[PDB]
Amino acid sequence: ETQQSAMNSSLDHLQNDLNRINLQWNRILSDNTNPLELALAFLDDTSVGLGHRYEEFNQLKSQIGSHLQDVVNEHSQVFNTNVASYGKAVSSIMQAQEQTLNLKNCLKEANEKITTDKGSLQELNDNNLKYTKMIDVLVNIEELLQIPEKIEENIRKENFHQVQILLERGFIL
Amino acid sequence: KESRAYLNDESLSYIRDPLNGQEMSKELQHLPNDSMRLNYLVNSKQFNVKAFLRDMHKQDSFNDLNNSLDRLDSDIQDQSIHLKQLVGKNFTKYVKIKNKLDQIYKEFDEKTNEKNQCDSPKENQINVESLNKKVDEVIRTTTFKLKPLMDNYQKILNYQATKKFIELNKFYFNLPKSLKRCLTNNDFNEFIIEYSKGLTLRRRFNQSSDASQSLVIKRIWTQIENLLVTYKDLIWNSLINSNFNIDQPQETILSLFSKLLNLENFI
Amino acid sequence: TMENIDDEVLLEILTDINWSIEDDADSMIERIDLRLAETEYLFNQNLLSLQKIGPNIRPYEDKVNDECHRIIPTLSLFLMEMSNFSNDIENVESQDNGLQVESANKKLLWNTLDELLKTVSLDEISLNQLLECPIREKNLPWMENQLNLLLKAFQAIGSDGNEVEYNLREISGLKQRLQFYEKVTKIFLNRIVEEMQKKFSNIRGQDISHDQMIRILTTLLIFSPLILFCKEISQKSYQAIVENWNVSIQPVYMELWTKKISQLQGIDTNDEKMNELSLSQLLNEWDTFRKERKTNDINPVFKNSFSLLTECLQTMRQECIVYQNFVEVFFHISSKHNFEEYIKHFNDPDAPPILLDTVKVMQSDREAAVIETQLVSRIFQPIVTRLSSYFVELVKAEPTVAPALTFYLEN
Amino acid sequence: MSSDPLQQVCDLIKGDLSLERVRDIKEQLLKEKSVVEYQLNKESDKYYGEVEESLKLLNLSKNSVTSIKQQINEVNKLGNDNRFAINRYDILFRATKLYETVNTTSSIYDRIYNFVALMEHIERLLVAELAEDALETGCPHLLEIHFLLTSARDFQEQVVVMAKEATEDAQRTVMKLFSRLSGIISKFDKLLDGLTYDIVEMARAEQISLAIRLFKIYDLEEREDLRIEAIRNIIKKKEIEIEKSSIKKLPNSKNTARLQDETPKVIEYPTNKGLYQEIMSGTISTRTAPRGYKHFLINGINNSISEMFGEMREKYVGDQKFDVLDNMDWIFNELIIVKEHIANCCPPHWNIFEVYFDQYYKELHSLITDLVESEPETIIILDILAFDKTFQDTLKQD
């Protein structure tokens, strides 16, 4: 599908190209700028005289208005495309919500939330002061069981009891 | 906080403008930009050419050059006439439809990333600063989890290893069980025979597939070497001194060679 | 066949020994698990307020990034304010009637006719003509064009066919990328046979200790296959030509280093002579001129310190030339983008090592590590004189993004 | 260890060789480690998941927010596409020739400064309508807000007199200043005679269903419009403190200036470095700045018209001994009726609901003085002000 489109350009838009280009001589002659405070001081109000600047200005209103035959539909297009800085920078302000605020503060703060109240800083010690204690339970369960058994029932099978007395030497070591 | 703060005035003005786009050609009695491609007319603040796409009849597999092109020339002709003075001949609103269309975009080269903006609005130049410095601050967090995440993976790795030896009881043992059984009696013979029968179950865990369980391969490897040790012990005994029930020792070399070269026969 | 174990369950069971057997050693694993539990709760409250204030000591730099980024809040509300009020001036400016079918009708005349650039349908001239298998390897029509024609096969959203009021690829999408991915399925099997074939030539490539330099120049002949932006692995297939094809072809390099590195075995027997040179040292010292020189110390001759620059370098083939398999992972799949355009020019990685800012994962370092350490095992004179050797090995790799740190942690 | 020898005392509380009681003591240690690992288990899990969301959002916002400001690289660098391209026509002659006559606002300033003189001399009585209400002016949303927009057209002589600070001439704010004598303070004070007489007209016992509707509607329209207007001028010193104090106070000047900056860094120079953050362009663009005290500074006189009528209804004697809160709390009932009636009238400003609690400052401060010493009936001192404490609580939201 080629989609052959017939706008109003290169015959309409040539009046914007040539007659609004009178501003090279017309707008530089009347010099209708710098500032809009002529008859606020009530002095001149022309000044003088914004007719050739209205020949270029009205050449933008009419000669680029007859050029705006189908181009006042189509100048008329970046109202949803020159707001690309409005779709992003506020999104960058949302990103500044996310990064200048939420990444740094959720980072170091939502990091630092689960803190002491662990707690573990007590309880892992209380685990340790259980655990090693329970270790010295079972090791002292071992050695106190060892020499009473080894000398008793391993009377006969010597050099199997050498293992047992070695383990008592470790457990009391 | 809409003066100025860039968001509440953009939400109020620019997003009250969004519903003004949603009811511009849609509420123009009635979706006059299209021919009812969508009742809600998504979106009409932009094209949304999958939703509102009915500016003329076709709209077909190739006939978008037929009538959608004739929609372009049709409403570009009717809008070439009506838009010549709708905002056309009064083109101060078209000088402003080029001012906030191009000169605001000329300020969007100054509201870009970056380029020749000022450039001392500091955005500009790290747009991936959360990757440029906060993946570097998150690389200080990689120094953090360098301890902690590795602790989590070795943690659940060790718990999964407890699951793994929990998932292997007769096998991954039976090195010292059949090994201590071996020199003990005969090994019963069942403490070699039935022990490597019910272990030949899980030695066929190590044989119904092996890839690449060098753990389980080491298991049935030491099963093999131990079985060879009782083999050469058996024929060493029954050969050299030769003093037992001779039929029993030949039954030992017989059955032990049967299983031994049965698994070597599988090899 | 490859259950939840053998993912270093060997190295898990390499705590002490799987030497008969033990469930006692399983209890020993429970003891090491509680040791890690107190070391990791210890890391937890170490980092929970303390080094979470160490993370607030990081938020000097990071909240400072939120401070230049808080100027980006002023740059973002400055640009968003210029475009907020100026876009409100657009809302009153172009929409004087507004009435977008009377004031801004570039898209209300053209609700679908402004989106009318979908004429590249469909298939399949240059998909197999501009790439026989390829026509490439000179930034040629399969690199420059038929690649980007397969990007047009992916620019065609093959399941977003019509939206029939638009109807761009209603029946054109039935066989656009089905003939472009049928002919490029033949080019895909062509690069798959070029992957097993060229990677079997890389298995023949064993250039210089080890070095797979033929796999490096051959890896230059594979950067276009992984760049190949559709995208490149359409169904996890180009990476399976880079990984599942290199699955067995890791074990040619891994089997190569496996049989290779474990053969340097040579040692002494009994060195009471050198203890009569460090007993003869203190005899004529000091009280004299020393004696020792520093004398032997015959272990300082690199019987095992040779591997500290060799099997740390061959470990840096399992790691850092596997970080030149970070030039062969896909490569470095990035970046060419249409579809072989930028990597049509830029297909030359280092890759090793080189910095640290990423998140990734890899393999092919198990047996070189276990070979280097398990080789170094019965070493009873070391690590007394090898203090800064094994601690330099401990403090080897800080700044890379490779697992050579975990190797240095294994070291 | 220093715990273990103490634990050797704790298990040496079983005897000396006490293997059965050593076993049971080990079961006690197993109970202690058991519960300590239940709570350390789940607590460690909650901390671990906190680290999981912590690094999960440091991830998700490092990457995704790096692609949100880098999505502003995508869409904002897409903003730089049509910078000198867009709108398919003579935009150069649209912004420099057709917008040259936008710098030609002379005759509008002559007939609108002159008509701002004469017609707001007329609107010094017409838009300053009073005597007595006739719906508060009559119709102060027509009248007093006609003096607000007539003072917003004379915010060219009130707020954009502070924007036109030596723009191009000398009589733009001098020959038009005698055109602003009957122009600005005959419109702004006309909106303040209509605003003080609007809220005073809203302080008139009904006040009314159309008088406080129109009057308060002007006193929320020009009140909140004045609030965003002077908030746009204070955000012209805060958008200039954001902008010109990122220019003058970069710091790279580095003197900085003497003496138009520090002070007034950052304002910084009107028309347009000190004005265009409240002026064109600027789609507002004056800021407004009507009316300043419609109820932007005159909603305090409404809740202080029931809290100055309320405080005025004390009659400090207390007319028997403590009848201050009788008429004062009657003006608190009129403060609830005028409050909810005015929020029914005006949402943005003009006594939404603060008249009730302002009249609770009137009844609170009033009842804390009628029996301060024993000057009231000492036998009936606390019963009166306490009876209006709990009863005037129960007569309202309490």
Task: Return the bridge partners of B125, or none.
Answer: B123
Instruction: Kindly compute the dihedral angle of the four CA atoms of residues C324, C325, C330, C334, in this order, to the nearest 10 degrees.
Output: -20
Q: Do B97 and C94 touch (CB under 8 A)?
A: yes
DSSP letter at B155 equals H
CA C288, CA C267: separation in Å to the nearest integer?
33
What does each C-alpha distance from D72 to B5, B13, B100 come to in angstroms?
18, 21, 20
CA B213, CA B223: separation in Å to the nearest integer?
15
Distance from CA of A34 to the nearest CA of D (A): 7
Q: Do B151 and C91 touch (CB under 8 A)?
A: no
Alpha helices by DSSP H, listed for C319-386, are 342-345, 366-375
Q: Do C53 and A112 touch (CB under 8 A)?
A: yes
CA D201, CA D208: separation in Å to the nearest integer?
8
Would you tell me the crossing angle of helices C23-45 and D19-69 to the nearest 10 degrees? 50
Would you tell me the crossing angle of helices D19-69 and B137-146 to the nearest 10 degrees? 160
Q: Is A127 in the C-facing interface, judged by CB distances under 8 Å?
A: yes
DSSP letter at A61 equals I
Q: Do A88 and D101 touch (CB under 8 A)?
A: no
CA C247, CA C231: separation in Å to the nearest integer?
21
Q: Do D281 and C86 touch (CB under 8 A)?
A: yes
Instruction: Kindly compute the dihedral angle of the four CA atoms of residues D26, D28, D29, D32, in this order, to the nearest 10 degrees.
Output: 160
Measured between beta carbons, which residues in chain A are less than 8 angstroms from residue C169? none
Looking at chain D, which subunits does it touch, using at least 3 CB pairs closer than 8 Å as the criterion? A, B, C
The one-letter amino acid code at B82 reads H
Measured between beta carbons, which residues in chain B are less than 8 angstroms from residue A81? 101, 105
By CA distance, what is A136's nearest residue in D? D4
What does each C-alpha distance from D38 to B83, C27, C31, C209, C227 come to in angstroms?
77, 20, 17, 54, 52
Residue B240: which H helix or E strand, with range? helix B214-240
Residue B246 CB-density burial (10 A; 0-12 exposed, 13-18 middle, 19+ buried): exposed
The one-letter amino acid code at D33 reads K
Given D40, D242, D243, which is nearest C41 (Cβ)?
D40
Given B7, B76, B105, which is nearest A93 (Cβ)?
B7
Instruction: Count the helix, strand and coil residues of chain B and give each as a percent rounded to the nearest 5.
Output: 55, 0, 40
CB D317 within 8 A of CB D345: no
The one-letter amino acid code at A13 reads H
Nearest C-alpha neighbor of D161 from the set D172, D151, D169: D172
- 3-class state of residue B125 by DSSP: strand
Token readout for C48 is: 């929970």
Token readout for D258 is: 């003497």
Distance from CA of A164 to the nearest CA of D (A): 18
Question: Which residues are CB-contacts of D317 (< 8 A; sequence separation ≥ 6)?
Answer: none
Phi–psi pair at C172, nearest 5 degrees: -75, -25
> Resolution of this PDB entry, in A?
4.4
CA A46, CA A44: separation in Å to the nearest integer?
6
Nearest C-alpha neighbor of C88 from the set B105, D234, A95, A86: A86
Cβ count near A144 (within 10 Å): 17
Measured between beta carbons, which residues in chain A are less than 8 angstroms from residue D98? 56-57, 60-61, 64
Measured between beta carbons, which residues in chain A are less than 8 angstroms from residue B66? 1
- 3-class state of residue C411 by DSSP: coil
- 3-class state of residue B123 by DSSP: strand
Return residues 159-198 of B near C (CB < 8 Å): 159-166, 172-176, 179
Distance from CA of A151 to the nearest CA of D (A): 17
Question: Which residues are CB-contacts of C121 (< 8 A; sequence separation ≥ 6)?
Answer: C156, C168, C169, C172, C173, C176
CA distance between the termini of chain B: 82
Nearest C-alpha neighbor of C113 from the set B57, B49, B78, D87: B49
CA B52, CA B233: separation in Å to the nearest integer?
90
Q: Do B3 and D229 touch (CB under 8 A)?
A: yes
CA B132, CA A127: separation in Å to the nearest integer?
42
Residues B20, B21, B23, B24, CA torsion sign: positive
Provide the strand spans (E) within chain D: none
Q: Is A52 in the D-facing interface, judged by CB distances under 8 Å?
A: no
Instruction: Count the helix, strand and coil residues of chain D and give each as a percent rounded to the nearest 5.
Output: 50, 0, 50
Given D3, D170, D176, which is nearest A133 (Cβ)?
D3
Cβ count near C205 (within 10 Å): 21
Secondary structure (DSSP) of B71-87: HHHHHHHHHHHHHHHHT
CA D139, CA D212: separation in Å to the nearest integer?
9
Given A2, A5, A93, which is nearest B76 (Cβ)?
A5
Q: Do D94 and B127 touch (CB under 8 A)?
A: no
Q: Do C89 and D76 touch (CB under 8 A)?
A: no
CA C205-C210-C211 angle, 5° bins: 60
By CA distance, what is D279's nearest residue in C? C85
CA D57, CA D76: separation in Å to the nearest integer?
24
Q: Is A99 in the C-facing interface, judged by CB distances under 8 Å?
A: yes
Q: Do B108 and A82 touch (CB under 8 A)?
A: yes
Token readout for D125 is: 């009585």
Secondary structure (DSSP) of D180-239: HHTTTTTTTTHHHHHHHHHHHHTTSSS--TTHHHHHHHHHHHHHHHHHHHHHHHHTTSSS
CA C371-C374-C377 angle, 5° bins: 145
By CA distance, what is A85's nearest residue in C? C83
SS (H, E, C) C275-293: CCCCCHHHHCCCCCCCCCC
Q: Do A5 and C110 touch (CB under 8 A)?
A: yes
Measured between beta carbons, which residues in chain A are less than 8 angstroms from residue B111? 85, 89
The one-letter amino acid code at D95 reads A
CA C108, CA B24: separation in Å to the nearest integer?
10
Token readout for D93 is: 């002659």
Measured between beta carbons, which residues in chain D are less than 8 angstroms from residue C77? 242
CA C245, CA C192: separation in Å to the nearest integer?
8
Task: Return the bridge partners of B123, or none.
Answer: B125
Measured between beta carbons, which residues in chain A are less than 8 angstroms from residue D68? 91-92, 94-95, 98-99
